[model samples]
Target: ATAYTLNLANPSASQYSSFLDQIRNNVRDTSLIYGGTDVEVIGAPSTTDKFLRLNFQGPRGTVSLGLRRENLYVVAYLAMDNANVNRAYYFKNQITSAELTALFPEVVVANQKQLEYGEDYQAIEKNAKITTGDQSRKELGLGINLLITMIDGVNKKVRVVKDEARFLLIAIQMTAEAARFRYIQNLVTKNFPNKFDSENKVIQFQVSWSKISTAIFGDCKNGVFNKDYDFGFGKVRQAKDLQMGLLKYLGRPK
Candidate 1:
């Protein structure tokens, strides 16, 4: 029997005339389990200027989902982790609301404005932060985009681990610090060895929006990514690399 197929909604326009078409092409269902409540994408087929939004399984105000052209940044002003099933993949004490308010004072202002309007349009930017070992550092823009992608990588790793059903529950119950450390240790040590002499050492690099696409596309001809073909392969390779790192950390048995 063939594998399950996505109930992909038809795109309103056949031709790629606008940014809406770009969004319509890229937006995909990221549900945790197969046949689970599919996260919905909202956008006008005819309107070419508006942002593509998402409809969560629970109550949420209008939330726009788009990538900023300036830095390929992801903009979704909604709680991305509200789904109950998603809880298992996240660190329990990863970051607290109070901690966020302390790190980014903007959190308070954003919260006040949100409450004043009695709306639940939580911003992904507000929730953006990077956890390194015991510390969670505030980040924005492209950092948030990268962080979301990393979490998605981890989430996909967990799915693979669960599907394998090889490890005990304790494997998935490691402390937040341990999990964070292992992530950096594997990814940094192997992937960026030239920049960082060791996983324990810190290093920094900068890349503009254009540089990102250029750097990734420069190395390969095909850049498109799908289940079967990696005709285009930047993020796909990175995701798999991270998956390999996490698998190593988890001591996945062959």
Candidate 2:
């Protein structure tokens, strides 16, 4: 929160942080393990599980983007807050290919293989308890099959990375604008419950609930496009490698 300049002094920021903290607690409370097991009783905690925050401060308000893993779930979220207006808005979704498509339909992938692989990847993670090691190895074999399919496909790996970066930047911009619009829309809408309440601050929640973690963004005062893409920072192939490694680890006999 300090990295994002979330000061406890500001009333809006205080409310925002409290809300986020509650969300974190709720996820912890409701978490599961290997499907058949309970994480609360048997899990070893890791300090590496911290929320990754990408703050985009705009003229009207600040939009904060965050990513974190709560047990088996990977969460990507947006938070918008304005000190002047004393209001905040939030949105979050699980990072599934389908959710990605819904949030960023404009981002068209060059190949279907990556999406399909991700689909199965998440499915395997979700059904870890029921899936056997033999089944896991078979899926890994199929992962390599899909990887090879992308080796000589149209658009190539380079195009795929660029598209992903574009999708990410667009998400930042969309959330920023969505925050701006939500604030503005509330003021214009006479039916808003808190329109007349100056003493009461408002926080709106639209939340949703994932695994493989990566961060590739920086702080921007304006739009997401303002920050140039760091190709050196881009790692689609490396991400694939990490996925493969995870699959192999999961496939290992316990």
Candidate 3:
């Protein structure tokens, strides 16, 4: 009905608990649990008895760079059962972009419109019978997620606070982006092995997937020259960690 902001809001823990309650109602169980920063994650995957996702908390209360349980697909899968996509949005002040400040306002407004148009229903499951039914058809797991976040500019804290409006806006966008990403991924995956031979490196990966949760990457490549490799990010170890994480999630042999 309306859009809002949290200038000095300190969102409460109970709020997140309730949000998780809603997510469980739909996803049906804790199917996947990952804790990269921890020694070992607790809990087992199940879909039969109870739909309870084991909560993940980093030592510093921040998630890792790659896999975090609070990302899109886990929640969105739950959201799929119901028209209210509120549970789908669970970003902890996290986003994808280097120029965050530069992209801040753009992120805000696009999301503003998303909410303004009731994108919760519009994007996930409503009006357009044209959208696919479930996670099955498009091979939709997490996909090339790209976006930015905003500062309330007031009361930034020891813990990441919830921006309900922003998260839903981003979540709706996340759902759409996931399918769109897979579309592009399909193109590159089919074409790359054939198209980029002239890049002369011919670095080809047999792209893969999983049923429950995964992340898709784009424009991803690397080179090993003079005992050095660069993938547009940090050291070679960073790239290795990223690939290893993706492989683990996709059930690909490490």
Candidate 4:
């Protein structure tokens, strides 16, 4: 009989893809979608993974099944915790409008805004800077960011502590700093020419999010993340050489 559990130890791109195709076709039925209304997505591991990606799962969303692993028993996201199963019991039974209103409340924004956010939306931040009247600093309108905390390193899994936002800022800074690492500069143009003038100087680097066929690491912080999640790798090295830093692998030069 085929094993029903995900090994997480050795996995591939194919199994994860097939499993996701099934669930996205339904988009619900997983513990993640809701308790009891769970989708029957097969449980298996999403390997560091590749592009057998499906494009959408919601009306206005892209399929961020993100290797479709969450329903596959994925957990231990710093052990914290999605389009999730919140309090289904509230809906299982009905009460007066007052009863429902008093049950749960967090953000004051319209519920519709959040629903449309669906699952693919990344990094919702909510922070507050509290000032203790001359006794301390006044709290500013602040937030946290689920997406911000989820950073990945291709070389290996890294540690993120209470200072997640600090880390996120540092990572964002690195991307800016690395832009100087040079975007599609004639980088190797010592061998060729396209955007170069007769003097062999670059006039511009294509500034667009257009797709590139390859990806490269830059001075930016090391990360492999989707809009809604973090987690990859294709590099190999000596046990110690595996110790290089990570950040988003820049879309390869066009």
On TM-score, the candidate that comes out on top is: 1
- Write the residue-wise lDDT of candidate 1 on 128-152 in tens digits: 2223442212111112123223334
Model 1 TM-score relative to the real fold: 0.23
Which tens-of-lDDT digit does each residue in 1-254 have in candidate 2?
22233322232433433433433333343332222221221123344443434343433344334443223222332322121222111222335444433333333332112322221222433333224453321222111122122222211122333233223333332222123223322332333212132111111111100122111112212112223322232333222211111110121112
Model 1: residues >4 Å from true position, as ranges? 1-50, 59-72, 75-134, 137-212, 219-254
Q: Compared to the true structure, candidate 4 yields what TM-score?
A: 0.18
Model 4 lDDT at residue 101: 28
Cα displacement (angstroms), candidate 2, residue 156, comes to 29
Tell me how candidate 2 scores on lDDT: 0.27
Better of 1 and 4 by TM-score: 1
CA-only RMSD, every prediction: 18.9, 22.3, 17.6, 20.1
On residues 162-198, what C-alpha lDDT tens digit does candidate 4 reach at each position? 2332322222222221122122111322322111211
TM-score for each prediction? 0.23, 0.21, 0.21, 0.18
- Which is the better candidate, 3 or 4, if ranked by TM-score? 3
Q: What lDDT does the true structure give each of the candidates?
A: 0.23, 0.27, 0.25, 0.21
Inter-residue clash pairs, candidate 3: 28-51, 29-51
> Which sections of candidate 2 miss by over 4 Å?
1-13, 30-96, 103-254
The 10-residue segment of model 3 with minimum total lDDT is 197-206
